[PDB]
C-alpha cells in the first residue's frame, strides 16, 4: 500500500479493489435495494444502470452533481476507465495527486514536475481511430500524430485527419 501503492499508479495496472466508474454527468439519481443497484442519473438521452458485487459504498444520495469519475463505490479510481471517462487531461492530474499522497504520508517531499515528466511519458501514445495512412488500432505517439494533422492541412490538401484515441 505504500511502495506496491506507487507501481501500481506507475504501472497503469488495475487497481486492487477496484471502485467502479462514472460515465457520464447528469444529477446524481441511483435506486435503492436489489442485488444489480438500477441507478437512474438522467443527462441528455442517456440515463444510467451499473452492477457490482454487495459489499460496496455510495457516499452520494439522488439530487447532485454525477459528473464522470466521481466517487462510486469509493476506493481505488482505475485509471484506465477514468481515461475514457474524464479525459487525458484528468488522470494525469489524478495520478500525480496519489502517488504524491502516498509519499507525503511517510514524511518525505519531493516536488510534484518529477512525478509530473513520468506520468507524461505514460501518456505518450495514442491508439488510432480512424486510418487515413496507417492502420487503425495502431499504438502511436501523440507527438506523431501532431504532424499528421498540422502538415496534411497547412501543407498539403490531404483533408483526412487521423482520429486517434488516448491512450494511458
Do not use: C
Not at 504501472?11 to 441511483?30: L, Q, T, Y
Request: hydrophobic share 40%; no cysteine.
Amino acid at each position: 500500500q505504500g511502495l506496491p501503492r506507487v507501481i501500481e499508479l506507475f504501472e497503469a495496472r488495475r487497481p486492487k479493489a477496484k471502485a467502479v466508474i462514472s460515465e457520464i454527468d447528469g444529477v446524481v439519481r441511483i435506486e435503492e435495494t436489489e442485488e444489480k443497484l438500477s441507478v437512474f442519473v438522467e443527462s441528455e438521452g442517456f440515463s444510467k444502470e451499473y452492477k457490482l458485487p454487495k459489499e460496496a459504498r455510495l457516499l452520494v444520495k439522488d439530487g447532485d452533481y454525477v459528473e464522470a469519475g466521481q466517487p462510486l463505490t469509493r476506493g481505488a479510481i482505475d485509471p484506465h476507465q477514468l481515461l475514457e471517462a474524464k479525459g487525458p487531461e484528468a488522470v494525469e492530474r489524478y495520478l500525480v495527486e496519489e502517488i504524491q499522497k502516498v509519499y507525503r504520508a511517510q514524511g518525505v517531499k519531493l516536488h510534484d514536475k518529477h512525478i509530473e515528466i513520468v506520468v507524461r511519458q505514460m501518456m505518450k501514445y495514442v491508439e488510432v481511430t480512424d486510418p487515413g495512412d496507417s492502420r487503425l488500432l495502431e499504438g502511436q505517439v501523440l507527438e506523431k500524430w501532431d504532424v499528421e494533422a498540422l502538415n496534411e492541412r497547412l501543407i498539403a490538401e490531404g483533408k483526412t485527419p487521423v482520429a486517434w484515441k488516448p491512450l494511458l
